[PDB]
Design an enzyme around this catalytic site. Structure first.
Site, PDB file in Angstrom:
ATOM      1  N   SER A 127       1.826   4.003   8.850  1.00  0.00           N
ATOM      2  CA  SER A 127       1.832   2.893   7.902  1.00  0.00           C
ATOM      3  C   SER A 127       3.240   2.432   7.546  1.00  0.00           C
ATOM      4  CB  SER A 127       1.085   3.283   6.630  1.00  0.00           C
ATOM      5  OG  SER A 127      -0.274   3.551   6.909  1.00  0.00           O
ATOM      6  N   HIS A 172       0.821  -1.217   0.000  1.00  0.00           N
ATOM      7  CA  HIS A 172       0.000   0.000   0.000  1.00  0.00           C
ATOM      8  C   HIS A 172       0.856   1.268   0.000  1.00  0.00           C
ATOM      9  CE1 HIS A 172      -3.712   2.329   1.001  1.00  0.00           C
ATOM     10  NE2 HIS A 172      -4.288   1.278   0.442  1.00  0.00           N
ATOM     11  N   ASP A 186      -0.225  -7.061   2.307  1.00  0.00           N
ATOM     12  CA  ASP A 186       0.289  -5.703   2.324  1.00  0.00           C
ATOM     13  C   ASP A 186       1.757  -5.723   2.706  1.00  0.00           C
ATOM     14  OD1 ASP A 186      -0.054  -3.066   1.854  1.00  0.00           O
ATOM     15  OD2 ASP A 186      -1.325  -2.658   3.590  1.00  0.00           O
TER      16      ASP A 186
END
Length: 232
Positions: free
Chosen positions: A178, A40, A85
């Protein structure tokens, strides 16, 4: 990160930095040559900053590198946001261990639920706002049920996910964490991936890429099996 402290320099040398227009994603160094992060977090033309600590002061040894190579899970859904991910990043030039730079060792065993683990990053430090720190921040969370992930998030989290948080709420990752690390007992365990707004909500834990489920694929690539894929 929320409900935590500014991070000590001894604990984030694995955390790397993704920038081009500004800040894109956190990262993790796994060895002198290879960095890890979330799929991502792929931006089309980006670079690496290793061993950043404080905006207000640059320590004698930050290191800037480029992405020679990248890899994503071959069996991955190209559209679906959260499945597998994970992305490696071969640095175009090897990096040396100094004060502000050091690798994180991979998982040999997975984290047995109820363990006390450490999240970190440069993401927002607040529940509702965008308040960005000068040094990274740290917080202890627990690893929780796979039902308390599925009770909180009506979209089915990947069988290849970690679930962490603080049951009653109060410590969670945030907008901009993230691709950061989730470290349990010196060992790297999860990769920050998604959660909820606002951060720190009761029975609403954060979702991480189960690093242990892809440690084979991590190594396969690192040896040269470009064909190799991850377990569905």
């Amino acid at each position: 990160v929320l409900g935590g402290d500014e991070c000590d320099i001894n604990e984030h040398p694995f955390l790397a930095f993704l920038y081009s227009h500004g800040y894109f994603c956190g990262l993790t160094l796994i060895n002198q040559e290879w960095v890890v992060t979330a799929a991502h977090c792929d931006s089309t033309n980006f670079q690496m900053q290793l061993g950043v600590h404080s905006k207000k002061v640059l320590n004698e040894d930050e290191q800037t590198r480029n992405p020679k190579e990248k890899f994503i899970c071959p069996n991955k859904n190209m559209s679906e946001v959260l499945d597998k991910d994970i992305m490696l990043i071969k640095l175009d030039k090897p990096i040396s261990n100094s004060k502000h730079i050091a690798p994180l060792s991979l998982p040999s065993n997975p984290p047995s639920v109820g363990s006390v683990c450490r999240i970190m990053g440069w993401g927002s430090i607040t529940i509702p706002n965008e308040t960005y720190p000068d040094v990274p921040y740290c917080a202890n969370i627990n690893l929780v049920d796979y039902e308390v992930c599925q009770g909180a998030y009506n979209g089915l989290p990947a069988k290849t996910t970690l679930c962490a948080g603080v049951l009653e709420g109060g410590k969670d990752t945030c907008v901009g964490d993230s691709g950061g690390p989730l470290i349990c007992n010196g060992q790297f365990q999860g990769i920050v991936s998604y959660g909820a707004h606002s951060c720190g909500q009761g029975p609403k834990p954060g979702i991480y890429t189960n690093v242990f489920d892809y440690t084979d694929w991590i190594q396969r690539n690192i040896a040269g099996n470009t064909d190799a894929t991850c377990p569905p």
